[PDB]
């Protein structure tokens, strides 16, 4: 059965930035194959320079996004290198059957390992690192990602008529716990295991030093920000591994949102804020229809201007003065 | 166009009471004018006399509810009397386009503005100050409120059947992040200013010191209990600028709720508890069944219980024994 | 009226299991009688040793689940025996009036009283002690438990077909506070009074020291899984009194999901994680697919795995290689 279907092996892109793919499905079901490389790595999440090592899958946080069918196969082949000192793994939330694929991954390195799964339910599902003993400091260390499994129909609203967007992003929403001397002062270490000890005692505290998107603060922003044009329908898939968090487009609004991210359910409607929970991936669409820059920010704000949750979007076209218009600038009384 | 339609002048109130209006829309799309000055002021939140500056919309915490129907025009006169000594703005949730009004607002101290937005989408709204680079600190020190967009044939139930409230409340609730010394006693300043630098390590630590309605520890008990009678319909708006919150009435429910707040979505039926993300407004409806107190709470208990988030509703009636009945009262075994 | 009605006395069982009951009802409207003993003891909750003072209803921490049918009325008889030390009540979210039936059922050590109220809202609904200004104290040393009314023609789908359940266990989360001394180490207490004062100053800081089901880190692990086979039909309810939790199957889904509870609303589809708030209970209905164990998790993971909040399914019966399968087990590059 398996046997006689066809393959098609998919190169994956770094996040944002999603790799090519149908909305509407043009063939049956086949078994897609991706390739995954775990990269342990230091990474500089802010601007003072604060520093940490992160776990990856395939060298980003978070990991690629992977896109297909409803049916279709995921066949993943998972590399650790010798070059990387810990054991890592993948749980698909995406999948049904050993703990997502987590007791079937289990990776040292220098070796690797080949999975295959049905996708059976249509929806944006998390992946992550789940080694036994340690899977809050893989996730917490940057090792996650996201799969979206699209209906072979494509995405519909609440009255089943066809959505379709014109542009997809992805944002990985990491809170990361660095540990801290008796000052405050953020510390260093040589390698992942002389971190260990130190980092259990920060996650036990629940609260993270940094709730960053994209790996670092302030990563999609500047030169970096997402961009559209007025006119445009833009689908936002959000990931949250570990914590809830409540996506907000400053200016904008979600006009069809799956907070919890199944597509058989139907999506809930001009939406100015909405709650993923840690431990989802959700979708948002929107249709821009004014210009300039927006702020796309987890609402509660200290966590977005102070941690670093916070992005742009920089749209081009025409203002419309009809939606708003300053009447009375600003001037002394 | 605009200038041909009609306009109406409205005269705000202090929370929780709502200003008057239709809930039915009588007359076609007008413009709706509102006028709000900033107000910065020293307020004490507890029963031991802690003092916070806190930055007002018209003196109150939170600021008033405006209420309008889709496809109204607000335009709202902002007013920062010289008196002040800081930079505000206002962001509306409800509106499209620069930052929801935030990039074309910003007034210093002896300004003005007038700024006009399109209300296109039904539903209850945040809109809050947002000056860039201090946002978190303008608006958790009480600088938010909401506004309600009805839809011009009034709210409706799952099935399409016409709701109509006899009286509406709005509950604006308030994480507070009060600095402490060593022996944590909350500190005591002269201008916002002095604040400052102690206000943004409180925030970091994402852990509020009070959690309050109306801007005080019981500020909705005793003589200032909400009331109504056994038989009355009364819609609670309620909204949370920054953080998530989870409402609950003790010894009710909420018949109908929009724990989002957006109307062309069908309400949930019979919520025990619903959450309301931060950085967003809700709307419960319920039916009055039997009289009596009924505390009005956040249900993570510690926060309402001892951080100050609960209020009272007095209501009035005849006691229906078939609903409830103490069939032997507490005595000795 | 109720004079004329039948009645069933009820004998409860311990959590994760549930009493004896119809899903469809087989009779009219019943009077369903209960009895209920407080019982204050002490309780290891951890590995360590760590010890509280728990106020429990039946001796179980969560107390026991009530399943009645909408329109049942539930009568209650509730003592607080001589041997107990603290004033006790009880607040069913079920209930309409007196504050859930708090204000109606005050004991002291060596009084009992009987309430009856009407279940008119079909759901899971949570029950707790709640005694006038220590109701957060009593709630977080494990006083608390929940009711489910079902609908008198049993639970359905989305398209209001048939949703039939082979089995059902119930799931109560504890979030703990524990007093600490400075070095970071548990403080023991000779009665439950004597813990007061440091109990209070330890839940204002709202980080739990511990986060459990079933009363204790392990309690439904090993030989204290959950079980079930390859095709049978699992409802499992899930209540969190006090804060929010995020349920997650590890290897599975939600597939049908009423996460704030509440019957009348239709449920969600496919869940891979859905967040129930503090002072709700929620139910999933999933159908097993693959054998082996499933980790059943708060989502947080650091709060699942550092705090407490996970437990296990061991499931029997045969491997369907279609749904996953390892192409190529770990092996060396
Ligand atoms: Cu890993
Ligand atoms: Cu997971
Ligand atoms: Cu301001
Ligand atoms: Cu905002
Ligand atoms: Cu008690
Ligand atoms: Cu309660």
Redesign the pocket.
């Given at each position: 059965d398996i046997s006689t279907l066809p393959r098609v092996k998919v190169d994956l892109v770094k996040p944002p930035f999603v790799h090519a793919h149908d909305q509407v499905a043009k063939t049956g079901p086949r078994v897609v194959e991706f390739t995954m490389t775990?990269e342990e790595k230091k990474l500089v999440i802010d601007r003072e320079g604060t520093e940490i090592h992160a776990?990856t899958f395939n060298g980003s946080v978070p990991g690629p996004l992977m896109v297909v069918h409803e049916n279709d196969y995921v066949e993943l082949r998972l590399i650790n290198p010798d070059t990387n000192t810990?054991?890592?793994?993948?749980d698909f939330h995406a999948a049904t059957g050993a703990l997502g694929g987590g007791a079937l991954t289990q990776v040292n390195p220098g070796e690797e390992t080949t999975l295959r799964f049905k996708a059976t339910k249509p929806g944006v599902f998390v992946y992550?690192?789940?080694?036994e003993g340690?899977v809050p400091?893989?996730?917490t260390?940057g090792?996650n990602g996201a799969i979206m499994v699209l209906p072979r129909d494509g995405l519909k609203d609440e009255k089943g008529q066809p959505l379709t967007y014109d542009k997809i992003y992805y944002v990985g929403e990491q809170d990361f716990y660095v540990p801290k001397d008796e000052a405050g002062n953020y510390k260093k270490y040589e390698t992942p295991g002389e971190a260990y000890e130190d980092a259990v005692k920060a996650m036990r505290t629940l609260t993270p030093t940094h709730i960053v998107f994209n790996g670092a603060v302030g990563a999609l922003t500047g030169d970096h920000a997402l961009t559209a044009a007025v006119g445009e329908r833009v689908l936002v898939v959000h990931s949250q591994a570990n914590r809830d968090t409540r996506p907000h487009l400053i200016g904008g609004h979600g006009d069809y949102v799956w907070a919890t991210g199944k597509f058989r359910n139907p999506p809930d409607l001009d939406q100015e804020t909405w709650l993923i929970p840690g431990g989802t991936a959700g979708a948002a669409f929107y249709t821009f229809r004014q210009p300039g820059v927006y702020a796309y920010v987890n609402h509660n704000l200290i966590e977005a201007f102070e941690l670093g949750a916070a992005g742009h979007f920089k749209v081009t076209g025409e203002w419309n003065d009809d939606l708003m218009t300053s009447v009375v600038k600003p001037a002394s009384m």
């Open positions: 775990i776990m810990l054991l890592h793994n993948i992550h690192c789940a080694p340690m400091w893989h996730v260390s090792m």
